[PDB]
């Protein structure tokens with residue numbers, strides 16, 4: 001049970017990594033998804049004299065809405081699995097025992113935020129493309145693949161690199177917003193980066209000396 | 211008349227957002243401005259028999275010059291409404307009781323400074339228009355709307371995005387200064403952003419800890 | 421005597437501003453220079469020693485290049501730091517002034533580097549001339565100084581606007597040195613400012 | 620023994636600067652095995668306690684390791700760029716087009732200066748825009764470089780802010 005919580009933390013990290021990715025890029029394997037949802041089902045099973053009434057006190061329903069399947073496009077409906085992060089949020093006291101764990105959690109949450117912003121950025125640059133201004137056209141013109149166009153690997157890597165540059169104050173200049181929606185997204189990313197960057201790096205600066 | 215203070219704070223935020231924008235861009239709705247003017251007249255009437263003499267020789271001058279009308283440049287003279295910020299300045303004691311209020315005030319003042327700098331940036335670009343050196347010409351050439359020219363939405367979003375990028379010190383490389391006035395303004399904005407960061411956005415973890 | 425010390429600080433700021441600029445740009449008003457020199461002579465006379473005499477030698481009969489020895493007047497400000505380090509915004513104002521002075525000196529060095537290779541499309545001066553529509557005599561002294569100061573400020577603040585970027589080995593090494601100096605100075609200045617701001 | 624430790628530290632800094640430089644730039648297999656000298660820094664790592672007497676010494680050590688990390692990342696970046704140059708994609712071709720000599724191409728001095736300048740710009744979060752990644756390998760390397768550079772920013776200038784108040 002002691003390692004069960006850490007395993008569940010790894011599983012929620014995995015699903016937070018791979019649910020927006022599948023809902024943004026690969027939407028047009030499932031074995032790992034099936035295994036992970038089975039593990040989450042067995043976890044809610046073990047988590048339940050009769051402490052069941054204590055469990056059904058506003059904490060079981062939020063897991064239930066994040067446990068049921070949606071089988072009956074539909075990536076938006078399986079995007080609801082992201083509610084599982086409340087499980088790792090409810091027991092932060094156990095995970096924050098050691099400073100190294102805190103540093104690992106800070107790095108993981110920064111990477112997760114960058115990944116989520118990358119997925120949102122790709123969605124923004126993809127839904128507008130059918131209507132040479134979008135960043136996908138610039139990406140295709142830069143590499144030797146005019147828009148077929150670049151493969152999904154190149155698009156994801158470029159989106160992640162641009163988001164990391166935006167949050168890290170670099171501003172590389174290869175990828176640069178052109179459309180109004182891209183500029184608004186960049187403004188929101190700048191505000192979010194101010195918040196996170198400041199808090200995370202102040203926290204690590206405090207932590208390192210301890 | 212206790213929650214009225216936060217309503218007047220919201221109206222102050224509204225006027226500080228919409229007066230510089232109107233002056234900078236719309237010089238070439240009025241109902242909302244008339245409503246907030248009537249509301250501020252009601253407020254200054256409420257501010258009033260032994261207590262009238264107290265502030266009669268105090269804050270009356272500013273709160274009266276900020277509420278007098280000029281309808282009879284009128285648009286340029288309408289900028290006198292910015293004196294309503296002294297209300298928030300003087301009544302800061304009631305707006306600094308909770309950490310959430312402090313964070314909201316910090317975000318609001320950051321956004322307000324960015325908006326004001328965007329308005330000044332567009333003002334400079336407009337005064338330099340009749341003399342592809344300027345940034346408006348480059349923006350029009352790059353969003354596919356050669357100089358007609360970009361719409362007001364495009365110009366405002368571009369100005370706000372440039373100001374946010376430069377204050378945050380990202381420097382995206384889409385819009386860049388190309389005139390002496392623009393370069394001096396950029397130097398000033400860099401100084402303002404660096405001071406803003408090193409003054410407030412440092413130790414934001416400790417700020418939140420309050 | 422406090423008014424005298426503040427005026428001396430202002431004149432030191434003036435000479436630190438105007439000596440490197442003159443040496444870098446104006447070399448290939450004198451009345452104000454002579455007035456300030458006479459005022460510094462009367463200041464050392466009323467002070468009643470070696471470090472003051474060497475920096476105040478009248479250079480008569482390259483003189484303009486050799487005039488940089490007048491930049492030895494900031495040490496005099498350093499001695500009387502007790503009155504400058506005092507409660508209020510004076511410390512923050514002085515820190516901003518020295519940051520701007522470092523930016524100005526680096527801008528002068530950047531223009532000196534750019535001009536030494538101008539006679540030899542490659543280089544920031546040619547790019548600057550092309551951008552503002554004055555192909556290479558190209559840009560005026562005002563344009564060159566503003567561009568150099570803007571690039572130096574962007575490099576020190578790490579904005580990196582991308583309008584002006586190093587494109588030669590000399591400029592690249594200079595930008596590396598400015599990056600190191602800016603890291604150290606940014607850390608120091610905006611750590612002490614961020615610690616002072618608690619008052 | 621006081622002067623001996625400083626001399627050994629200088630020699631360790633010298634070999635740590637030189638060996639990856641040779642391996643990455645002056646290849647033309649023995650150098651790959653010779654790069655095992657990088658583990659020799661464990662001596663300075665264990666004697667850092669002896670090197671932590673005064674704030675000036677630790678500040679200079681911080682600047683030295685900043686420069687060393689920048690140098691190693693520059694060597695790795697040059698190796699990445701050179702592994703794809705034979706097969707306008709990349710940064711070597713763009714650099715050759717910029718400075719004037721098309722791909723002969725730039726000399727070793729120009730290539731190293733460009734690599735170090737880009738590494739410093741990415742580490743210090745400037746992003747000059749003169750040279751930018753254009754391949755997936757380069758993009759991933761840049762992504763790693765931003766994080767390590769910002770971590771070193773936080774650490775070494777938090778230290779610097781600590782000593783300056785002392």
Ligand SMILES: COc1ccc(CCN2CCC(Nc3nc4ccccc4n3Cc3ccc(F)cc3)CC2)cc1
Nearest residue numbers: 166167169193194197377378407411576578599602603
């Ligand atoms: C050349 O040598 C050097 C060495 C070091 C430095 C300081 C660089 N470092 C200092 C912090 C700077 N960021 C930054 N400005 C901000 C302005 C307002 C609010 C927040 C700000 N934030 C944090 C931030 C960062 C990224 C982001 F997306 C959003 C916010 C920029 C990062 C400069 C020159």
